[PDB]
Each structure stands twice: as C-alpha cells, then as structure tokens.
Design a protein around this ligand. Structure first.
Ligand code: PYV
Ligand code: BR
Length: 182
C-alpha cells in the first residue's frame, strides 16, 4: 500500500478511463521530453463542463494568469485556428501562441499546441477530455500534455511547473461549473 497525490487518478477512476488514457493521454517520451496526466473530479454534469472546456477562444473563463487572449476576426473555432494569449505581468512567461489541434463535440475531446511565444514550454501539446461518472451524476476531467525539457532543467522541474498551472486551472474549472449547481 502506497501514497499518491490528488491529481493522480483513483483506482475506480482508472478502471473506467484506462481506454481514454490509452487513446488520448499518452505520448512518446524519451530524448529530453516529459509528459504528465492530471484528473479533476467535478460535481457538475459533463455537458456543462464540456461547454466551457471547448471554448478555445475564451480560455480566460477558467485558466488563470491570462491578461488577455486575442483571436482574429475571420476566426472560426475550428481545427488549425489560433489564439495569442498574453500572460499577466510578473510571471516567467509573457506571451503564448497556441493552435487548436482537436475538437470533437461527440467524444468531448480537445487539444492545443503551443507554437510558441515568449516562454520556456517548447512544443507543448495538450489534450483534455471530459467524462461521465455514475453510482447522483458527476464529471471527471483529464488533462495531459507533453513538452520539451529546457537545456539546464530537470524533467521533474518542468513537470512540477506545468502541473501547477494545469492543476489550478482545473480547480477554477471545477469551481465555476459547480457554482450554479441546481
Ligand atoms: O498562455 S497560457 O494560458 N497557456 C495555457 C497553458 C500553458 C502551459 C501549461 C498549461 N496551460 C499560459 C498560462 C500561464 C503560464 Br505560466 C504559461 C507559460 C507558458 C505558456 C503559456 C502559459
Ligand atoms: Br516559461
């Protein structure tokens, strides 16, 4: 018997989601890369959670640390389209340019890449999936990513970093989506 964190999946969680992990949240590692997987349980229906997560043009809605995110005018939210996001002042990243890779309203799957900008997460690729859970009906959100490990940094350092941003983001996501409830 061991000890995991709360971002790591529980057993019941993993047995239901394993296939999803197999398909969407698994990356080719090795050679200065690193990846990670985070879960968040949310006492709200998947449909609500998905509608927020999918808003590629308005990540501010739940991601932290965004001063602004501009898309273009002839911007239609569809695969290949992009967003220029500006981070608040005082952080170790100023701007990010991200491309939408993946948008499936049927399977509630989405993902973007960073291509890139003023920061040190080179070639970051993320995927986020939402799932239904029953026993009283809740949601589980999985977010994973892979990204390059910068010159004089450890892979553990890089994972810690990305993990934190994602972890807080999902907490915000949880928070607003549970917010109205019923
Ligand atoms: O532009 S982002 O909103 N990208 C979304 C994002 C970026 C990285 C991890 C998870 N999610 C963003 C926010 C905060 C930090 Br620190 C970032 C640092 C580098 C690049 C982008 C950054
Ligand atoms: Br950075």
């Amino acid at each position: 018997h061991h000890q995991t964190m709360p971002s790591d999946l529980t057993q019941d969680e993993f047995t239901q989601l394993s296939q999803s992990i197999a398909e969407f949240h698994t990356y080719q590692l090795g050679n200065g890369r690193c990846s990670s997987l985070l879960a968040q349980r949310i006492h709200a229906p998947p449909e609500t959670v998905w509608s927020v997560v999918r808003r590629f043009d308005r990540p501010q809605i739940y991601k932290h640390f965004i001063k602004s995110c501009n898309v273009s005018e002839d911007f239609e939210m569809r695969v290949g389209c992009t967003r220029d996001v500006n981070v608040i002042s005082g952080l170790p990243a100023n701007t990010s340019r991200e491309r939408l890779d993946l948008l499936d309203d049927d399977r509630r799957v989405t993902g973007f890449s960073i291509t890139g900008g003023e920061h040190r997460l080179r070639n970051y690729k993320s995927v986020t999936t939402v799932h239904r859970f029953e026993k009283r009906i809740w949601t589980v959100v999985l977010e994973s990513y892979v990204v390059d490990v910068p010159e004089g940094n450890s892979e553990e350092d890089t994972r810690l970093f990305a993990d934190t941003v994602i972890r807080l983001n999902l907490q915000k996501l949880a928070s607003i989506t549970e917010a109205m409830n019923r």
